[PDB]
Amino acid sequence: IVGGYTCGANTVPYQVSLNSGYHFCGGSLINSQWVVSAAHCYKSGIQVRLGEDNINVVEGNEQFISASKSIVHPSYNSNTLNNDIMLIKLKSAASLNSRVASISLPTSCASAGTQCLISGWGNTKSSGTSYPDVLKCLKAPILSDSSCKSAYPGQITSNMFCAGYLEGGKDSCQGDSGGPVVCSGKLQGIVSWGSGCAQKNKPGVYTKVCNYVSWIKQTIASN
Ligand SMILES: NC(=[NH2+])c1ccc2nc(C(O)(O)c3nc4ccc(C(N)=[NH2+])cc4[nH]3)[nH]c2c1
Ligand SMILES: [Ca+2]
Ligand SMILES: [Mg+2]
Ligand SMILES: [Zn+2]
Ligand SMILES: [Zn+2]
Ligand SMILES: [Zn+2]
């Protein structure tokens, strides 16, 4: 996350860290047994880490659980990143508390203008590499699809939306990947892609989760 701030320990209780021997992506807990993340974060051998803040220090509120199954969206296009969402099932159900909580899926999609919270342990330098050990937050509004499409002509579909600052400076970045974008209490986006990070006129692109609620509910009930 570039131009963000330190969230604070366990202030984003639904945030997860996907670890395959090191943190590689983020994700969101949707109930005690399932996590939603991005399909471009797909790997085999994933361990989910809940209650994290400093991912390099066992501070006491973590739960480390292995994934029993991963389901990448059936129409995921790795070339365009259209339908960039995946579901991970845990081997054991997590114990939810103040520090580990699930986030609610939306009833409707959110409007442009709406401010959201995005978080992750991803890169924090636009030009450089600096990876943080504690969770970083960023508040950004959803941009109109018009400015999104102008920034990325012929690359945006109806399953994506942009959020950010066209002036540059603030953005999610690699590592934040799969992470949450919460606006008004609902999970509305998944950190998917961008052009570099925090570049002017190159806002972040997010998966539009409100278009996947029936797939998510049907998939978790039958698995
Ligand atoms: N080595 C790894 N473990 C790793 C993990 C995830 C990655 N994801 C990318 C990316 O290439 O897929 C990537 N994810 C992005 C998310 C947001 C923005 C943005 N808003 N500018 C840009 C991004 N680029 N590389 C990655 C490398
Ligand atoms: Ca920790
Ligand atoms: Mg994240
Ligand atoms: Zn990359
Ligand atoms: Zn990238
Ligand atoms: Zn990524």
What region does 90 belong to: left with phi over 0, alpha with psi -120 to 50, or beta?
beta
* Integer-rounded Cα radius of gyration of the chain: 16
* The CATH number fitting domain 1-12+103-210, selected from 3.30.300.30, 2.30.30.180, 3.30.2130.10, 2.40.10.10: 2.40.10.10
**Residue nearest (by alpha carbon) to ligand 1 atom 4:** 24
Binding residues for substrate: 171-172, 174-175, 177
| Identical topology for domains 1-12+103-210 and 13-102+211-223 | yes
Which residue in this structure is represented by tokens 């797909």? 42
User: Please, are residues 191 and 206 in contact by the beta-carbon 8 Å criterion?
Assistant: yes
Binding residues: 52, 54, 57, 62, 171-172, 174-175, 177
- From the CB of 177, is ligand 1 less than 6 Å away? yes
Q: Alpha carbon 162 to chain centroid distance? A: 13
CB atoms within 10 A of CB 134: 16
- From the CB of 28, is ligand 1 less than 6 Å away? no
Surrounding ion ligand 6 within 5 Å at CB are 174, 177
Q: C-alpha dihedral over 136, 29, 165, 158, to 10 degrees?
A: 160
What is the CATH code of the structural domain delimited by 13-102+211-223? 2.40.10.10
Question: Smallest Cα–Cα separation from 207: which of 64, 82, 53, 95?
Answer: 82
Give the separation between CA 116 and CA 106, rounded to whole angstroms: 13
Question: Smallest Cα–Cα separation from 196: which of 171, 165, 222?
Answer: 171
Domains of the chain by residue range:
1-12+103-210, 13-102+211-223
Give the separation between CA 42 and CA 109, rounded to whole angstroms: 25
From 174, 202, 206, the mutation candidate for ligand 1 (largest count of ligand atoms within 8 A of CB) is: 174
Which residue in this structure is represented by tokens 């499409």? 149
Q: How far is the CA of 199 from the centre of ligand 4 (A)?
A: 15
Burial class (CB in 10 A: 0-12, 13-18, 19+), 45: exposed
Task: Please report the DSSP string for 66-109 in residue order.
Answer: EEEEEEE-TT--TTT-TT--EEEEESSPPPP-SSS---BPPSSP
Encode 159-169: b = buried (16+ Cβ within 10 Å), e = exposed.
bbbbbbbbebe
User: Please, are residues 48 and 36 in contact by the beta-carbon 8 Å criterion?
Assistant: no
Q: Would you state the structure tokens that stand for residue 178, as one six-digit string?
A: 């799969």
Q: How far is CA 106 from CA 87, 94, 180, 184, in A?
A: 16, 22, 13, 9
Question: Side by side, which strands form the sheet with 186-193?
Answer: 5-6, 136-141, 115-120, 180-183, 186-193, 204-208, 160-163
Give the separation between CA 172 and CA 165, rounded to whole angstroms: 11
**Residue nearest (by alpha carbon) to ligand 1 atom 27:** 174
Which residue in this structure is represented by tokens 């986030």? 103
